[PDB]
PDB file of C-alpha atoms in Angstrom:
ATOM      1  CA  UNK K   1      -6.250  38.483 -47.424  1.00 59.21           C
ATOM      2  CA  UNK K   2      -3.179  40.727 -48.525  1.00 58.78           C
ATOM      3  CA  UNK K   3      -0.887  43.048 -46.930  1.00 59.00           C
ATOM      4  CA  UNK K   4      -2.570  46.069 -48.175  1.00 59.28           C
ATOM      5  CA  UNK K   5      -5.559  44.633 -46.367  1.00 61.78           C
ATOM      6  CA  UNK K   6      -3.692  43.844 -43.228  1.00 60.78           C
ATOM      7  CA  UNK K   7      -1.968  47.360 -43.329  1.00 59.31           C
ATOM      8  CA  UNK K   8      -5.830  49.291 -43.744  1.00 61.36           C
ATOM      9  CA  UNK K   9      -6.750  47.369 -40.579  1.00 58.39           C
ATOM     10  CA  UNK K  10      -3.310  48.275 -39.200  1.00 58.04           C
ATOM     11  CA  UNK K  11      -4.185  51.962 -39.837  1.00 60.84           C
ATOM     12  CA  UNK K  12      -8.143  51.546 -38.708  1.00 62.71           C
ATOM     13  CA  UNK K  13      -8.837  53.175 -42.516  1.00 62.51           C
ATOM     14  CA  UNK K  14      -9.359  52.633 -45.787  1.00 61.83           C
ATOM     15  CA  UNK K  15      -6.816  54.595 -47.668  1.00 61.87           C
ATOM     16  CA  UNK K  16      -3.288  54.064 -47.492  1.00 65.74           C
ATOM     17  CA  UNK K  17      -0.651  56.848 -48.391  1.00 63.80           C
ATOM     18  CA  UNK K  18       2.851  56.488 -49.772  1.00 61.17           C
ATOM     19  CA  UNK K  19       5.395  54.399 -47.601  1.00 62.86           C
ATOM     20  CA  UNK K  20       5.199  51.938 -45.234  1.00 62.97           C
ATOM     21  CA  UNK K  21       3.574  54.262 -42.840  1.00 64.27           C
ATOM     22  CA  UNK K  22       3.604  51.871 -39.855  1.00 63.57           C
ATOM     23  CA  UNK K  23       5.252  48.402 -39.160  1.00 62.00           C
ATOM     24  CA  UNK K  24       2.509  45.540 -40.787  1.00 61.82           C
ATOM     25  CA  UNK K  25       2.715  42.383 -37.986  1.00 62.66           C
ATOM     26  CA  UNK K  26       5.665  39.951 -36.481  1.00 65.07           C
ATOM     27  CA  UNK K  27       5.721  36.758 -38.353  1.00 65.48           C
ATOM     28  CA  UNK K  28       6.198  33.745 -35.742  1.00 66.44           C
ATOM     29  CA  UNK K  29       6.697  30.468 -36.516  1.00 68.54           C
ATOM     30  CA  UNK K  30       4.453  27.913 -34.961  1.00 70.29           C
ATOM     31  CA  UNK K  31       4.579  24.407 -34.048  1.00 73.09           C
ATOM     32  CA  UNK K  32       3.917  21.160 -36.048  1.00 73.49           C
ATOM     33  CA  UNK K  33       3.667  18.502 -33.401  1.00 74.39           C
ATOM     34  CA  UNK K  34       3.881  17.607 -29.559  1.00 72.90           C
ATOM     35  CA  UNK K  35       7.264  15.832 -27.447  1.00 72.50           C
ATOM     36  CA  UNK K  36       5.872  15.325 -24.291  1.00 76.00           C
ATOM     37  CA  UNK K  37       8.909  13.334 -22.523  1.00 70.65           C
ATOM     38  CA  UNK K  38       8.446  13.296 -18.992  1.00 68.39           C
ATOM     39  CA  UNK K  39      10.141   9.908 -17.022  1.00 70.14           C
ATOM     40  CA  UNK K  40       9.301   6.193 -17.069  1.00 69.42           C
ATOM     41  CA  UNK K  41       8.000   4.142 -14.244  1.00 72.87           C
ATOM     42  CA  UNK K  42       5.402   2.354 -12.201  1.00 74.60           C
ATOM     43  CA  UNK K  43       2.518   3.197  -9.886  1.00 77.25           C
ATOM     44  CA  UNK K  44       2.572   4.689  -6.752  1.00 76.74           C
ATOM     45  CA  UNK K  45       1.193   3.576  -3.175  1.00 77.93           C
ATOM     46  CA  UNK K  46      -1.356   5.068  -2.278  1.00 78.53           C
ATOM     47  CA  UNK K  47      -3.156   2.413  -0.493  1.00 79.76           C
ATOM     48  CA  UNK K  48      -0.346   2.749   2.225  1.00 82.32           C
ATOM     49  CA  UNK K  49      -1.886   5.961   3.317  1.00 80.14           C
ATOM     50  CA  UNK K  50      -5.511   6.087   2.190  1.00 83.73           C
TER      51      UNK K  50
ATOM     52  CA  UNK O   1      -0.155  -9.826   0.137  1.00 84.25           C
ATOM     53  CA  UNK O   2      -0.811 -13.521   1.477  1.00 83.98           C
ATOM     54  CA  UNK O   3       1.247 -15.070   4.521  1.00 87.22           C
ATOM     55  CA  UNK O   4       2.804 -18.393   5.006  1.00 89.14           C
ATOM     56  CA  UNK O   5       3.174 -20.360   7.552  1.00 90.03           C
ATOM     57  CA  UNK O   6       4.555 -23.861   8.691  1.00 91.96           C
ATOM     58  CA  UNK O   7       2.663 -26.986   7.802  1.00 92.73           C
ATOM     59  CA  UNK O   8       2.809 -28.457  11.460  1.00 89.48           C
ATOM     60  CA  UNK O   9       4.300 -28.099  14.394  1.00 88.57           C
ATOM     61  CA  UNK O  10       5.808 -30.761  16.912  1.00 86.01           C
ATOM     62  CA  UNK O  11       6.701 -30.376  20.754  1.00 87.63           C
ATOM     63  CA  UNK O  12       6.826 -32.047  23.775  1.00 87.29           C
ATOM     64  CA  UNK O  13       5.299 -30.755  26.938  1.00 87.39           C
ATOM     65  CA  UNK O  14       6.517 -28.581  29.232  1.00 86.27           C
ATOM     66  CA  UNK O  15       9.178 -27.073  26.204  1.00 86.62           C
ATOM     67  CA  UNK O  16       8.247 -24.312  24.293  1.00 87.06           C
ATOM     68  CA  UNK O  17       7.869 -23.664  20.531  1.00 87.00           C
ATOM     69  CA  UNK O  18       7.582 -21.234  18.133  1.00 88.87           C
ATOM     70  CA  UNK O  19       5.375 -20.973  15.416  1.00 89.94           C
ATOM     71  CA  UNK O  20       6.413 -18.461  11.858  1.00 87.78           C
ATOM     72  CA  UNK O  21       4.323 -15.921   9.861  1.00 89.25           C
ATOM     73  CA  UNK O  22       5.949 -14.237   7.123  1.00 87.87           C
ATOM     74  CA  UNK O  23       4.657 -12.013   4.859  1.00 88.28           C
ATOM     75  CA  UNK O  24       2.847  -8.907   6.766  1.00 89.53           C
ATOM     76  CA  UNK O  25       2.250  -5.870   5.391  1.00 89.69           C
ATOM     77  CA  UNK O  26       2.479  -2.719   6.804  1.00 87.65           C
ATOM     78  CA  UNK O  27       1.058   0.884   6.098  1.00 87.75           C
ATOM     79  CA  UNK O  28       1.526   4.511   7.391  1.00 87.08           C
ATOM     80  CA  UNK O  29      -0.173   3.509  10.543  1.00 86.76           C
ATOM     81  CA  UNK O  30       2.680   1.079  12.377  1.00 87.99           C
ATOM     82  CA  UNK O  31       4.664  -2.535  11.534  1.00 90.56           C
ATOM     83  CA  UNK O  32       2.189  -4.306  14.518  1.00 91.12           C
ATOM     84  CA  UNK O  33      -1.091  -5.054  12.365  1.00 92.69           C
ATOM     85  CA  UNK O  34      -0.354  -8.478  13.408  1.00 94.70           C
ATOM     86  CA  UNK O  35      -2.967 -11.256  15.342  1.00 95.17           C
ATOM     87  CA  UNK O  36      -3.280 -14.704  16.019  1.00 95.60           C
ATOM     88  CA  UNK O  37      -6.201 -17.494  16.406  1.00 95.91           C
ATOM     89  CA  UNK O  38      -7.087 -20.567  18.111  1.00 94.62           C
ATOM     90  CA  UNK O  39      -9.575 -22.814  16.712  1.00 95.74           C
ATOM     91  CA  UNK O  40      -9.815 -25.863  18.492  1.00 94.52           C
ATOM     92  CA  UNK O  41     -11.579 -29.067  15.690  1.00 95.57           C
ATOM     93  CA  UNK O  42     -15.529 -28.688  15.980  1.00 92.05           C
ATOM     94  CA  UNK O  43     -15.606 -25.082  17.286  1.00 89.77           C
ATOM     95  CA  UNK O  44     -15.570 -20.881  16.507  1.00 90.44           C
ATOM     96  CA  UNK O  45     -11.744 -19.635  16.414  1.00 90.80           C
ATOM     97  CA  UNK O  46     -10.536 -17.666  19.653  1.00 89.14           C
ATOM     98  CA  UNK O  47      -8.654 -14.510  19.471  1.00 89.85           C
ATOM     99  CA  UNK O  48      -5.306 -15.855  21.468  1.00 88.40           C
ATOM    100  CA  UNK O  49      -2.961 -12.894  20.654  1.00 87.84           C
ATOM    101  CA  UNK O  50      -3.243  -9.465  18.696  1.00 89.69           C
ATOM    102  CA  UNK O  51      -0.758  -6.055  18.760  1.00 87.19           C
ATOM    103  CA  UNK O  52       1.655  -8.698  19.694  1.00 86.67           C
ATOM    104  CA  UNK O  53       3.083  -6.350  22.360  1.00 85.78           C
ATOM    105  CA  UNK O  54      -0.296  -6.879  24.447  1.00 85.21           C
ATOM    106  CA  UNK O  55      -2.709  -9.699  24.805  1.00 83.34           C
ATOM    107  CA  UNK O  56      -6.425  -9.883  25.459  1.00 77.74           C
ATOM    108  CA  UNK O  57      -7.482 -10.306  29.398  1.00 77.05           C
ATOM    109  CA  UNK O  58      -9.020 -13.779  30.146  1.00 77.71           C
ATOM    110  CA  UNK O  59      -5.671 -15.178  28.297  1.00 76.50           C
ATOM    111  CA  UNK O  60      -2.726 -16.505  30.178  1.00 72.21           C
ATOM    112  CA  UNK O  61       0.297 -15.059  30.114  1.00 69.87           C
ATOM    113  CA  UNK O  62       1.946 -18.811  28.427  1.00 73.26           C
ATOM    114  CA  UNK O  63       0.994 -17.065  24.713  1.00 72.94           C
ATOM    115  CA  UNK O  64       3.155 -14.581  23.884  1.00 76.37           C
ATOM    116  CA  UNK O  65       3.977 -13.138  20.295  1.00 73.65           C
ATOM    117  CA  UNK O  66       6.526 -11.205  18.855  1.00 73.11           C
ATOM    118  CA  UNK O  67       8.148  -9.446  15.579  1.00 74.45           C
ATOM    119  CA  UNK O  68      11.182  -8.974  13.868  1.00 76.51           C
ATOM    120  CA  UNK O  69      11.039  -7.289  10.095  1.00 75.28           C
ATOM    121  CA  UNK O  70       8.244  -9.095   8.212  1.00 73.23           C
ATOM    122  CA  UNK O  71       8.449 -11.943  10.323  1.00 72.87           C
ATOM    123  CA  UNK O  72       6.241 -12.975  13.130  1.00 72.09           C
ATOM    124  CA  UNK O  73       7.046 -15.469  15.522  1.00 73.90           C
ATOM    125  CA  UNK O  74       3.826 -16.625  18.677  1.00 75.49           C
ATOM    126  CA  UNK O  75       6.067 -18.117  21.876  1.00 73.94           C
ATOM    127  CA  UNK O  76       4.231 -20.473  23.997  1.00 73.06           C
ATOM    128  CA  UNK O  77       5.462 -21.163  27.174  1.00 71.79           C
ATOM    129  CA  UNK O  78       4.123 -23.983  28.715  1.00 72.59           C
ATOM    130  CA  UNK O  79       2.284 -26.923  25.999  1.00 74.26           C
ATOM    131  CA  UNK O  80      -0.283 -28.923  27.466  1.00 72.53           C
ATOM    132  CA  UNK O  81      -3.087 -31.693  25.858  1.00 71.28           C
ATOM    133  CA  UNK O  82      -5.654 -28.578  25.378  1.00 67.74           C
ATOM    134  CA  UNK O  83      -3.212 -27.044  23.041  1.00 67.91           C
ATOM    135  CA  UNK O  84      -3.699 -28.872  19.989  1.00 68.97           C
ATOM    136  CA  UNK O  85      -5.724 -26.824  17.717  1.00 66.76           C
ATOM    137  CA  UNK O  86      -4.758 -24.855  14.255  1.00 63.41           C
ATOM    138  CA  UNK O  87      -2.897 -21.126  14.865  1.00 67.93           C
ATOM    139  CA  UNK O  88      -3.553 -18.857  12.121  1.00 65.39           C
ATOM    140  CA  UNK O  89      -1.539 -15.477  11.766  1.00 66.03           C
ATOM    141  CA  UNK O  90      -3.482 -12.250  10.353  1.00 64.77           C
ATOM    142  CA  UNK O  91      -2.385  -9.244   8.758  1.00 68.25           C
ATOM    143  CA  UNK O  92      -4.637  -6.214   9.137  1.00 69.79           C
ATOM    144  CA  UNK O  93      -2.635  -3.751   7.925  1.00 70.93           C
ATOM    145  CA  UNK O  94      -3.752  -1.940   4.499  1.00 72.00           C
ATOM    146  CA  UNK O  95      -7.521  -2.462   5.506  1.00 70.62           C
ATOM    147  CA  UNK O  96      -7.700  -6.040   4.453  1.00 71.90           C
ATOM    148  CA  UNK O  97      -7.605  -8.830   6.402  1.00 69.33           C
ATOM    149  CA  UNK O  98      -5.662 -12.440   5.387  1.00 68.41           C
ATOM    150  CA  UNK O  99      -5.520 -15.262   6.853  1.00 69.09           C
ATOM    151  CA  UNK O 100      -2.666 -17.897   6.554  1.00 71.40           C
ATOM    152  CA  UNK O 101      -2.206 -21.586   5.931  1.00 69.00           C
ATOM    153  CA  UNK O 102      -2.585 -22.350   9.161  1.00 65.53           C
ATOM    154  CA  UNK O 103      -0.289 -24.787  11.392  1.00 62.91           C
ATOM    155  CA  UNK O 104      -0.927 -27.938  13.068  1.00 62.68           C
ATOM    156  CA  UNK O 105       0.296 -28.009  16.970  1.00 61.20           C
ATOM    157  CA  UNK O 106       0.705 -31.307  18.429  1.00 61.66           C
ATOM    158  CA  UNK O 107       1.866 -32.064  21.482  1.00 63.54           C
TER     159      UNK O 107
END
């Protein structure tokens, strides 16, 4: 909901003292959409061995 | 694939001729899945010559067949009167048997 939220589940309690008192979370950028570029070509023969 | 052959074939007796099949298809098994047929007008076709380095027994030794690349050739040695009948060519190679156009051997 709000970092003083996120910071009382950080510190398992709900009362915070002065300062940061521990390091909150690691933001990370996710991603939007998919490139799946693998080669172009045709089928393969199979019926040669099976 | 399908296989071609000649339309007819001409020769005189006592020569020898050679009749074409190209178009065999091969697998991870060999390059010989190659066999020929006689069928003589009003009757059942014969198997003349198959794994062209052998022959059948009961056949004489006048038929004989060979291969170079995707090309097969049958060799006939000796042409009499009872040799007039259609030769087919069959490839048996990727578990599917086809037969050609067929040739017509007149002596």
């Amino acid at each position: 909901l709000d970092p003083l939220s996120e910071t009382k589940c950080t510190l398992k309690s709900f009362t915070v003292e002065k300062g940061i008192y521990q390091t909150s979370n690691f933001r990370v950028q996710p991603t939007e959409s998919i490139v799946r570029f693998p080669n172009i070509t045709n089928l393969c023969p199979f019926h040669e061995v099976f | 694939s399908a296989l071609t052959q000649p339309p007819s074939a001409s020769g005189s007796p006592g020569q020898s001729v050679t009749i074409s099949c190209t178009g065999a298809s091969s697998d991870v098994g060999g390059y010989n899945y190659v066999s020929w047929y006689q069928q003589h007008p009003g009757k059942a076709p014969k198997l003349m010559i198959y794994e062209v380095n052998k022959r059948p027994s009961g056949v004489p030794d006048r038929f004989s067949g060979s291969k170079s690349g995707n090309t097969a050739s049958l060799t006939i040695s000796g042409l009499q009167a009872d040799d007039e009948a259609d030769y087919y060519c069959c490839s048996y190679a990727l578990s599917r048997v086809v037969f050609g156009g067929g040739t017509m051997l007149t002596v």
